[PDB]
Design a protein around this nucleic acid. Structure first.
Lengths: 48, 49, 417, 49
DNA sequence: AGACGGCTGGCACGACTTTTGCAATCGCAGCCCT
DNA sequence: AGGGCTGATCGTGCAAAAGTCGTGCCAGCCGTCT
């Protein structure tokens, strides 16, 4: 139910097909935070 | 150049140095740090707000 | 006092044409002039949250994409459907052909039959207007959605099948002969076609933000009111007095000379702004000299306007007035019109008068309003009406005005009763 | 482009474990962005483009 | 079923507009060339 | 000791070729009636 744009559609399909399966992905607000942090003189990234 | 350095400082933090206001409004502006800090920042409403 | 070629008096004036003066005129660039003035003031030394809702449907294109994705489609099928949905216009008709879509697919296994099947599944999409074809095909889809009890549905289908050209040209005789159309049955079919929701995608795009610029004002309260031409929007920028005093106090002689040059440039800019304001005021007075007469008389009662005559009345340079007219807008109580639209075309009229081409066009539109709905008024009939009005405009002038008014053809506009 | 894997590649994310933070340097700052801004204009009202 | 008619639109010619492409020569006099 | 000559500062126009419009007019064509 969050800003995960690629998750709301897929959960809706899983419901209408009665799958009831969820894949988290990543909230978009976290990407918002990363983009606004990189707006200043601070590097930030996520390793593997 | 002093104007430019001041403007960059205000863009980063207006509350610290200088006072920038909008048209007909004396309230300060929301700098790149303002939307990070305070009750109305990104970190707020991040805690499941 | 009638001698010719006598002793010549010494000239006590000069043209003094300067590119600075022409730029000062700026052809009344208005907002563009404001941007240029800002750029110069930046180049001139010593010169001068919200709500954010962000919520809207993507013209049902997102809705269509979700619905197609909502329906069970294979990964390749989903990709094909997404590609087809991308090839959708605002009206709802496919811009690219089926062959173009197949070429964009770039798969040897992909074929015309599979693409057609995918489009047909896509054709019966969630909202109306998903035909992606001619409105006749969309009309067929609507009729399929519509109940079969509708009268003349079979006749309408037969007409739309291969007699669409007959309907387009409004050739009722040949269409009736070919299709055995009954009397007033074509009227019922036309009424049904009226409720066909043409351009369904237009209604989906209900959102339409308004765009307008203030520019000049023609409020004219109590008559001849000096409605300022966006005096608030006028820049009226001035150089920095404190910096000028610093330049005046500059110890270095070269620095003082540079400050003096900057002050001369600022004085030039001030003269330019004052000239612009004075030209605006003079143009406003000249327009108000006859604008109220035109507004009260009406669009059809519009007298011809000559730029040279207006300049002569204002006593300024004719070329200056012509340049000021360009890129100028004047909002009025009636509406917002360009300065050229404020000016009137010249055309001959009877009884010692001059009639605007827009005036004749508005008169012709009023006449077209008073016409039989079944049979559009002929251009000959329009010429007869103009002769009745006594505007000294012949068939050619009437046709030109109709082209200005976008009058439909007599045969095309002709329809059954 | 086969048009079959292009769409699926859009919906992908990494493990993204162990986030790291550091200072910024002008070269890599240039690296993230693609365009250089020189004009203060935001939008034109003549064509809304 | 070939001609009447009116339309339409191209084709032309005068009459009004209009845009851009246009700036020297000073009177100071000190400096440089001869 | 005498000549050259150099750059400061020098402010609302216009016109001429081009373009473009007003107006008229002819040529064909289809709807039609004979």
């Amino acid at each position: 139910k969050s800003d995960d744009v690629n998750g709301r559609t897929k959960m809706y399909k899983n419901i209408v097909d009665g799958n009831h399966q969820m894949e988290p992905g990543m909230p978009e607000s976290f990407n918002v935070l990363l983009k606004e942090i990189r707006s200043l003189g601070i590097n930030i990234e996520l390793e593997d | 150049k002093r104007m430019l350095q001041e403007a960059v400082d205000a863009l980063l933090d207006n509350g610290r140095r200088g006072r920038a206001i909008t048209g007909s409004n004396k309230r300060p502006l929301k700098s790149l740090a303002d939307m990070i800090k305070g009750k109305q920042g990104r970190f707020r409403q991040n805690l499941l707000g | 006092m009638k001698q010719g070629l006598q002793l010549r008096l010494s000239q006590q004036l000069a043209m003094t044409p300067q590119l600075q003066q022409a730029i000062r005129l700026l052809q009344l660039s208005t907002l563009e002039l404001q941007q240029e003035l800002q750029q110069a003031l930046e180049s001139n030394p010593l010169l001068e949250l919200p709500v954010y809702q962000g919520e809207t449907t993507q013209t049902l294109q997102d809705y269509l994409m979700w619905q197609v994705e909502l329906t069970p489609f294979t990964d390749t099928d989903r990709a094909i459907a997404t590609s087809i949905v991308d090839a959708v216009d605002d009206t709802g008709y496919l811009t690219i052909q089926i062959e173009d879509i197949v070429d964009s697919i770039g798969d040897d296994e992909i074929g015309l039959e599979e693409v057609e099947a995918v489009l047909k599944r896509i054709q019966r999409f969630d909202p109306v207007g998903v035909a992606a074809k001619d409105l006749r095909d969309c009309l067929l889809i609507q009729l399929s959605q519509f109940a079969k009890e509708t009268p003349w549905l079979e006749e309408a289908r037969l007409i739309i099948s291969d007699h669409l050209d007959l309907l387009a040209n409004h050739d009722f005789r040949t269409l009736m002969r070919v299709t055995r159309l009954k009397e007033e049955v074509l009227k019922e079919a036309v009424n049904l076609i009226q409720s066909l929701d043409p351009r369904p995608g237009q209604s989906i795009q209900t959102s339409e933000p308004e765009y307008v610029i203030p520019d000049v004002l023609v409020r004219k309260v109590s008559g001849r009111w000096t409605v300022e031409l966006n005096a608030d929007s006028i820049p009226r920028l001035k150089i920095n007095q404190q910096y000028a005093a610093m330049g005046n106090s500059a110890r270095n002689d070269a620095d003082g000379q540079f400050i003096r040059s900057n002050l001369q440039e600022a004085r030039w800019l001030i003269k330019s702004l004052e000239s612009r304001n004075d030209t605006l005021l003079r143009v406003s007075r000249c327009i108000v000299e006859q604008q109220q007469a035109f507004f009260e008389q009406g669009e059809e009662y519009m007298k011809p306007m000559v730029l040279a005559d207006i300049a002569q009345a204002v006593e300024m340079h004719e070329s200056t007035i012509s340049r000021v007219t360009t890129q100028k807008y004047l909002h009025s109580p009636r509406g917002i019109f360009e300065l050229k639209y404020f000016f009137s075309s010249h055309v001959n009229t009877e009884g010692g008068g001059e009639a605007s081409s827009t005036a004749i066009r508005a008169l012709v539109k009023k006449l077209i309003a008073a016409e039989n709905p079944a049979k559009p008024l002929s251009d000959s009939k329009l010429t007869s009406m103009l002769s009745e009005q006594g505007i000294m405009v012949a068939r050619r002038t009437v046709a030109k005005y109709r082209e200005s008014l976008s009058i439909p053809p007599s045969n095309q506009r002709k329809q059954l009763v | 482009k086969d048009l079959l894997k292009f769409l699926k590649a859009q919906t992908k994310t990494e493990e993204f474990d162990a986030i790291k933070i550091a200072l910024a340097s002008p070269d890599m700052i240039r690296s993230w962005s693609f365009g250089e801004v020189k004009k203060p204009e935001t939008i034109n009202y003549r064509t809304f483009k």
